Amino acid sequence: LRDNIQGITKPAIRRLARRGGVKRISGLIYEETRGVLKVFLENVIRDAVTYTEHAKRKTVTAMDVVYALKRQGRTLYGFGG
């Protein structure tokens, strides 16, 4: 597993922008968005892994991600709790 940030695809970022209402997109937006998503995922996943490690588990459950997001201030509905 290496260089997986390229999995966030240019059409995918374009689709997300279109959902956000963007009409025209510069060519340098894709790298910036990849970096921003990398940072956000790093924070959320670190918190979730801490929660899973506290329970002496080896599987990251959806409840752990929900707790991590709630701690970050981004409470998510529909996945329990």
């Binding site: 959902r19 956000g20 209402g21 009409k23 201030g73 981004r74 409470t75 998510l76 509905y77």
Partner: protein, 104 residues
């Protein structure tokens, strides 16, 4: 045997709310009317959000409420939008909003 929800006239469980308040470590003691008040407030908020969700569902010629309807209901009502400002609804989408300058 008559339930406390029946006495209070509510649909949400007063007994369950009382047990949750006692077991949640909020205070040493929990008053008798606290579960009733909390259940009433929860029922009112559920009624508001469900009324708006059902109104959204009827506009789409659909009988069952899907999460998109709940998202539309929450975001279209300013007070509920403020209440659930930092909340993400799974499979909720976003409101249709295209800025005026972008239109031809």
């Amino acid at each position: 045997a008559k339930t406390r929800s029946s006495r209070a006239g509510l649909q949400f469980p007063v007994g369950r709310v009382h047990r949750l308040l006692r077991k949640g470590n909020y205070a040493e003691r929990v008053g008798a009317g606290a579960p009733v008040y909390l259940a009433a407030v929860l029922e009112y908020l559920t009624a508001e959000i469900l009324e708006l969700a059902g109104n959204a569902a009827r506009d789409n010629k659909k009988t069952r409420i899907i999460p998109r309807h709940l998202q539309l209901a929450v975001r279209n009502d300013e007070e509920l939008n403020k209440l659930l400002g930092r909340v993400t609804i799974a499979q909720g989408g976003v409101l249709p909003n295209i800025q005026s300058v972008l239109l031809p």
